[model samples]
Target: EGTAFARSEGASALASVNPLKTTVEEALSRGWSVKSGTGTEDATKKEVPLGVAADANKLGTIALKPDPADGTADITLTFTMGGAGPKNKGKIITLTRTAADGLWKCKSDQDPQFIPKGCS
Candidate 1:
């Protein structure tokens, strides 16, 4: 089945090698002080506190679908990281399974970007 695939944080080969919980923990453990989204072409324009983990309950559950024909799956990590919470909406990262790890990692260069061209 589809038990391997992931996207996020710093991982090797662009695919997630660690479990979701481990990746989230590692991301939270980082001391660089995350700023939600910024300093990139697709930054959110808002700065969230560093090392803040998204509330799974409040952020909703992760959705995933697998294509049995190709052994690839579509994963979506839903979370409210925007200024107005989920009402304003957060980024929905889409990633593919490239390995046999029970993890889903995102492409570092595929970070979410701002829309409407400077709404901040």
Candidate 2:
């Protein structure tokens, strides 16, 4: 019950973004290496198709972990590039969301140099 609710909320939060570039910077600040490109946005539907590669297709999966202390959820996104086997084909990145409203942001405490706005 609770898990289902969380998943739905997380998926809604992710799908709210139209394009990857909109949240790519915040994601990079959180620790994601997002290559510059107009990546597709449809994470809520299940598979996030990142159309960065010119040749092969890439896909990603998102998981959310809610924090009872700060009302935040850690979003983990795992991306698979190309049709390569279980080798160097996947990249996992985690970002933090402080609340259900507004765009997803990261904790500045993680990295002093890349402190995100509105993060204390």
TM-score of each: 0.26, 0.23
Candidate 2's C-alpha runs over 4 A off are 1-58, 67-88, 99-103, 106-120
Residues 1-120, candidate 2, lDDT per residue (tens digit)? Answer: 244443332333234232343454354344433332345533343232334332223323433332111223333222222232332223223344333553454321222322223332
Please, what are the lDDT tens digits per residue for candidate 1 over residues 27-109? 32442112322132222432222222333233222332321112222323333223223222344433433335535545322
Work out how many backbone clashes candidate 1 has.
11
Candidate 1 RMSD to the correct structure:
16.9
Query: In order, what is each prediction's RMSD in angstroms?
Result: 16.9, 15.8
Backbone clash total for model 2 is 0
Model 1, position 93: C-alpha lDDT score: 34
Candidate 1: worst-modelled 10 consecutive residues by lDDT: 1-10
* Superposition error at 5 for model 2 (Å): 34
Candidate that scores best on TM-score: 1
lDDT of candidates 1 onward, in order: 0.28, 0.33
